[PDB]
Amino acid sequence: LALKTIDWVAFAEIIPQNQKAIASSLKSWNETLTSRLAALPENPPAIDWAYYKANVAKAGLVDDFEKKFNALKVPVPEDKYTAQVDAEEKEDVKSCAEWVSLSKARIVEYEKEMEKMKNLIPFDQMTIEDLNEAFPETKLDKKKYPYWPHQPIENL
Amino acid sequence: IDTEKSQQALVQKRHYLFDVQRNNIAMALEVTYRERLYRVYKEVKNRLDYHISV
Amino acid sequence: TLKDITRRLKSIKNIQKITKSMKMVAAAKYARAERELKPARIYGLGSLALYEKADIKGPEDKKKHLLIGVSSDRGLCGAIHSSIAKQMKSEVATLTAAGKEVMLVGIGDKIRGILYRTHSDQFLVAFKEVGRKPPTFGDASVIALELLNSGYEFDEGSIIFNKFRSVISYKTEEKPIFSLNTVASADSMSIYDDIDADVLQNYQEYNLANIIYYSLKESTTSEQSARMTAMDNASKNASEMIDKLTLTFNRTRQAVITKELIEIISGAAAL
Amino acid sequence: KQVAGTMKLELAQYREVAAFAQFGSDLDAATQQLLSRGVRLTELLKQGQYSPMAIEEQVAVIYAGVRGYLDKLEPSKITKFENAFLSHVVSQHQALLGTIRADGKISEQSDAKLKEIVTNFLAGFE
Amino acid sequence: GVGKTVLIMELINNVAKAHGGYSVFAGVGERTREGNDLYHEMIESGVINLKDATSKVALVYGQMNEPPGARARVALTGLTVAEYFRDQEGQDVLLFIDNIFRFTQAGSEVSALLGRIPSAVGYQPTLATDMGTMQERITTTKKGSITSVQA
Amino acid sequence: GVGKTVLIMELINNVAKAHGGYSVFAGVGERTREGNDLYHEMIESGVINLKDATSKVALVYGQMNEPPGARARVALTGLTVAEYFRDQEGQDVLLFIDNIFRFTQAGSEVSALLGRIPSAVGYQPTLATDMGTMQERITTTKKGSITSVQAIYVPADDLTD
Ligand SMILES: [Mg+2]
């Protein structure tokens, strides 16, 4: 018996909206499956023989029944389902690994940018060029308005 | 920054999906297996009681 | 009979709880009827404050007259539609005594049904759907539209509603409604500025709509309160009837028990 | 006793006004909540046949029903809830029920645990 | 109004075709006009054949113009006729009783004639000397089953 | 749930302290469970004292599970105890009768057993006379008095019964 304990809202956090229902169904299955496990013990109580050895007057019926029972081996079925989900998990691991690496690149970039913005010239010594560098938005559109004051008079 | 940091832990948690599937696999397996064990136990008990009854 | 007594008692119990429910609903509407009055009361009185200050008196020498009466489409109010009916009848009588050509307009199915029979010729337009929903200025604007687009130039008019006084008290009141020529020719209107027939006409129409709205917002509160009180009285009446029926039921129950006992003992004592 | 006192009180307050249903939309909001909670409780009172609940599960469900947790759930689902929730509570909180049965009271510790479980399941419940 | 004798005749025919069971119709204290109408409708609906032996019902009629003793025991008569089918041929028989109301009022007349039990007692479906022992013979024996339809 | 038995015990205590007269409690047709509950409540509140000679009330019980003769005569038994306290001691006695409608019912049953024709409703033909010969002993004399407190049950909430 190898069962992996699980959160459940964490599960809900990682379901893409395209396939919620099936996942939810999956979820449902789990719970009822768990109940169905608690609905019966591990092994059935083996039928004794003496009670039938001394009460079943039929010749050999109890005997050959018990023997063919001992000679019976129930087919314990094999999954053939875990390997594929393992491989799918592996692929998903690769994908999320590359994703998180690229995102960490983006994070260190944001960090460097904020750091640049941190080391700033005290404003009373900054030229309009330094301001335009520190905020490319403040730069005037020398293309749409190539003439003074290079901006709509309204917002002036 | 932190939003990306949030996205980091989230994808980090993604592994729950697979093991839950695994959980249902091993569960349903033992279910059908044990169900078979009680099917065979019930059916032989039925014939046994039938003869001792009649 | 015990069974028919139970039947009638169940009937009266049914209508008793019905009136209880209706009374509580009417009180729930009296809530939001008294609230939306105060702003609307201020608004309507602010409208009228001009006529009040300039002290216009209307002409007593002209005949064409309009009588608007505000009511609802719902009954069970009590003395609401009856009061409006009586006031409108009395004033139609008094005015037509002076030969004044009087026309009628009724806001509400009830007042129109009450006044239509005895007064059908003296009638221009009525209105329905008033009473279910708390009245709003859109309604008053529609009414003013319909009144102006009627081919009837009233030289004077008056609206009659139920000025809500308290949860138990209401007074049937009657506000006057002047026409363009009245305010124009009023000498006391000479002190008002940038005034000409066009501006006075527009202002007249807007004040007509304003006063109709004000009357509506007053009458709805008055009617909710009256319905509350009337349903309370009906519940108490049905309760008294239930007590009478319970007395009669106990009497009949005793009689039935005694009769069956007599049957038993007389069928047994014959042996 | 702890849960049934308030249950009976609220049910009396519901019955003393239940005649005013079918026009609740036109009534005071507090009494409207009274009516809604009353309907919630009555549907919490229905029960299938040959299924006698244990006492601790009884107090658990009545608790989840009386503290307003179902005020936001419409009535036609309560029974569904009452089933699923109960299963949850007996599946992954057996120790809590064991303690409540060993004491017979909702201690503030077990009270907080009940807060936790009912909140979490309501959040998880459809 | 609604067609009900058609429903009774169809229940008879269907239990006789699907299963190998017959039916017994008791007319305990009932209008002779209705009884004749039903007898005819059954004849002309195939349930009864006056020229064969393939009829699917046995009739027991006690009309209203008979003493209370008649209209009280005419229920047990049909009950016995169906009891034979049940406990002799194992069938699932369909016993119709036109009214238990007629049975109980005819019986109350019986009890008032003897002058022992007052007329306020009526009949008790739980007393053995009353409808009790009749409503108990209509059960699911482990040899068959009578089932009673009471119009 | 309205504190009836507390009012009974307080009346007993007050009459014993102020007027110096004891009390009698006739339990006509009482549930035995309620009889025992009341007994123990009286033991706690000091009305009854199982250890000394300072008890205030004397109890007389005819329970719900007795033949109708006993349930009809228990009220007279309690009344006789109280009559002794009034006459031979010269006191102001209290006589609690709970219930009195069960006294009437016991009378009706005793009548129906003796084969007497029932009156109106179903009570005995001697209803008023039974109640009269009972109640006319509870009165004031030139020696003392007897003040009766009777719990009234109204059948089918009908006072014209
Ligand atoms: Mg019948």
Side-chain angles (χ1 to χ4, degrees), chain E residues 43-118:
Chain E
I43 284 179
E44 281 100 22
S45 176
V47 170
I48 305 187
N49 271 342
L50 305 189
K51 298 203 293 292
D52 312 71
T54 182
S55 41
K56 273 80 79 185
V57 74
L59 292 167
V60 172
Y61 282 158
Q63 314 145 34
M64 281 194 314
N65 71 327
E66 278 152 330
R71 297 169 300 121
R73 307 299 201 245
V74 71
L76 304 166
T77 290
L79 182 51
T80 288
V81 177
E83 269 201 347
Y84 162 90
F85 289 143
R86 185 195 70 191
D87 304 355
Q88 184 60 254
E89 294 151 36
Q91 317 179 1
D92 301 341
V93 303
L94 208 55
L95 164 72
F96 303 95
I97 304 181
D98 206 15
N99 276 313
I100 292 307
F101 173 84
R102 303 288 190 178
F103 178 33
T104 192
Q105 75 178 356
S108 309
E109 292 149 48
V110 168
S111 287
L113 290 168
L114 307 168
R116 273 166 330 138
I117 313 289

Side-chain angles (χ1 to χ4, degrees), chain D residues 67-87:
Chain D
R67 297 301 173 78
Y69 288 103
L70 299 170
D71 198 325
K72 314 331 289 191
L73 179 56
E74 58 95 13
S76 297
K77 189 172 280 165
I78 300 291
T79 170
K80 283 185 51 214
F81 179 81
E82 201 205 310
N83 285 356
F85 175 78
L86 187 47
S87 63

Side-chain angles (χ1 to χ4, degrees), chain C:
Chain C
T1 308
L2 212 66
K3 283 66 163 153
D4 303 338
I5 278 179
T6 43
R7 210 186 61 195
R8 180 159 148 85
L9 195 142
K10 283 192 270 193
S11 174
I12 287 192
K13 275 182 160 183
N14 179 67
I15 72 155
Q16 196 269 343
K17 67 180 177 64
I18 281 175
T19 67
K20 284 149 50 63
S21 157
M22 186 150 43
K23 165 212 171 60
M24 272 198 167
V25 157
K29 279 200 160 190
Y30 177 90
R32 315 186 309 102
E34 208 276 323
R35 187 177 35 100
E36 277 77 343
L37 164 81
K38 308 168 172 295
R41 159 165 296 155
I42 289 307
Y43 175 100
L45 296 187
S47 86
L48 303 188
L50 176 64
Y51 299 119
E52 321 286 19
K53 289 170 181 56
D55 203 345
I56 322 296
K57 312 332 299 168
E60 71 253 6
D61 305 67
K62 272 295 305 167
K63 336 289 171 306
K64 303 201 62 181
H65 196 108
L66 183 68
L67 278 187
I68 316 182
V70 171
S71 315
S72 162
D73 285 8
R74 292 193 39 78
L76 302 157
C77 309
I80 293 302
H81 310 281
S82 53
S83 296
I84 291 312
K86 184 48 69 191
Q87 189 65 271
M88 283 183 59
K89 288 166 191 175
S90 158
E91 292 292 30
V92 166
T94 298
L95 291 204
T96 45
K100 308 171 176 179
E101 191 276 326
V102 176
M103 200 58 64
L104 262 49
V105 167
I107 321 299
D109 214 30
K110 296 304 189 181
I111 179 66
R112 180 214 65 189
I114 292 184
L115 265 291
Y116 194 85
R117 292 305 177 265
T118 76
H119 298 275
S120 86
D121 184 290
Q122 313 187 350
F123 182 86
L124 196 170
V125 60
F127 297 94
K128 320 195 316 299
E129 281 283 325
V130 187
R132 293 169 187 77
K133 310 305 298 157
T136 44
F137 200 93
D139 292 327
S141 45
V142 178
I143 300 169
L145 280 183
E146 193 54 75
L147 263 299
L148 302 177
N149 304 91
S150 89
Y152 177 81
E153 79 307 339
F154 60 98
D155 214 356
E156 311 92 329
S158 90
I159 193 157
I160 302 161
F161 60 95
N162 301 265
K163 177 74 175 176
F164 157 81
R165 309 188 34 163
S166 66
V167 77
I168 64 184
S169 60
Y170 66 89
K171 188 212 305 177
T172 286
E173 274 194 336
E174 176 177 17
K175 283 298 182 48
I177 285 184
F178 313 110
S179 194
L180 203 170
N181 297 302
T182 309
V183 186
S185 299
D187 304 4
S188 183
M189 284 297 309
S190 60
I191 77 177
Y192 279 109
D193 198 318
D194 288 331
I195 293 313
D196 51 357
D198 181 73
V199 162
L200 267 188
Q201 180 180 347
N202 295 348
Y203 183 69
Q204 283 299 117
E205 301 179 5
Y206 185 71
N207 260 351
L208 161 74
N210 264 3
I211 197 159
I212 282 179
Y213 164 89
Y214 165 59
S215 87
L216 263 183
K217 294 303 286 188
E218 280 270 347
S219 176
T220 286
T221 290
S222 176
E223 161 201 355
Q224 296 316 305
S225 172
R227 165 161 307 128
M228 190 199 76
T229 282
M231 282 318 110
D232 195 290
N233 291 23
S235 279
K236 92 173 169 62
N237 276 346
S239 156
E240 185 209 340
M241 293 208 64
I242 280 172
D243 282 348
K244 273 197 205 64
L245 279 192
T246 294
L247 275 194
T248 300
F249 169 82
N250 284 342
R251 198 170 303 119
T252 297
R253 177 195 62 95
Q254 301 186 22
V256 163
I257 303 178
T258 299
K259 158 186 173 174
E260 299 184 3
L261 260 182
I262 290 173
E263 284 177 9
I264 283 161
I265 65 191
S266 293
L271 312 171

